[PDB]
């Protein structure tokens, strides 16, 4: 069974729109979103659909690009580091749950490489 997806809004959370945050959405996320390996990360893991019932028994801090996209679109973050942290959590979760020689890990590693490439050009 799946937990509630991570929050994309929090009225009592302090928010702020920075040039770095705009770049993370308009450039970083938008480009990664269109990558041939991006589709498994565009929405939370469905432990039932994927026959991975133990996923949310192992991953206690889930994250996906769909959540990050909504957070960016909702101006949920205070600075770029908060958004970058969500990306790092998404990748880390994948490497934790899956075996190093798995297709999904190869997809994550490719996206992580492109992600690191793009944040090295952060404004
Ligand atoms: C991301 C993630 N992190 O842990 C798991 C598990 C996933 C995942 C998410 C999906 O939406 C689909 C699949 C699976 O169907 C697949 C996808 C691609 C290659 N080989 C297998 C895996």
Author numbering: 43 to 165
Article excerpt on this structure:
BRD4, together with BRD2, BRD3 and BRDT, comprise the BET family of bromodomain-containing proteins, which function as readers of acetyl lysine (KAc) residues on histones and other proteins. Using the bromodomain-containing protein BRD4 as an example, we employed a structure-based approach to identify the L94C mutation in the first bromodomain of BRD4 [BRD4(1)] as having a minimal effect on BRD4(1) function. The aim of our work was to develop a technology that combines site-directed cysteine mutation with covalent fragments, allowing rapid elucidation of ligands to inhibit the function of the mutant protein domain. In this work, we describe a new methodology, “mutate and conjugate”, that combines site-directed mutagenesis and the use of covalent inhibitors to rapidly identify selective small molecule ligands for a protein of interest.
The L94 residue, which is conserved across the BET family, is part of the ZA loop and is located above the 5-position methyl group of the OXFBD04 isoxazole. This placement suggests that attachment of a 5-position electrophile could locate the L94C cysteine and the electrophile proximal, allowing them to react. Simulations, performed over a 50 ns time scale showed that the calculated RMSD values for both BRD4(1)WT and BRD4(1)L94C were comparable with deviations stable and remaining below 2.5 Å for BRD4(1)L94C after equilibrium had been reached. This result suggested that the L94C mutation would not significantly disrupt the stability or structure of the protein. We therefore produced BRD4(1)L94C, which was obtained in high yields and purified to homogeneity using immobilized metal affinity chromatography (IMAC) and size exclusion chromatography (SEC). Both BRD4(1)L94C and BRD4(1)WT had the same melting temperature of 49 °C, determined using differential scanning fluorimetry (DSF), suggesting that the protein stability had not been compromised by the mutation. While there is some small variation in the ZA loop where the mutation is located (backbone alignment variation of 0.41 Å RMSD for the full protein), OXFBD04 (3) retains the key interactions with N140 and Y97 of BRD4(1)L94C. However, in the case of BRD4(1)L94C, both enantiomers were observed in the electron density map. The position of OXFBD04 (3) when bound to BRD4(1)L94C suggested that attachment of the electrophile at the 5-position of the dimethylisoxazole ring would locate the electrophile and C94 close in space. Increasing concentrations of OXFBD04 (3) also led to decreased levels of BRD4(1)L94C labeling by 42. These results are consistent with both compounds residing in the KAc binding pocket and covalently labeling BRD4(1)L94C.
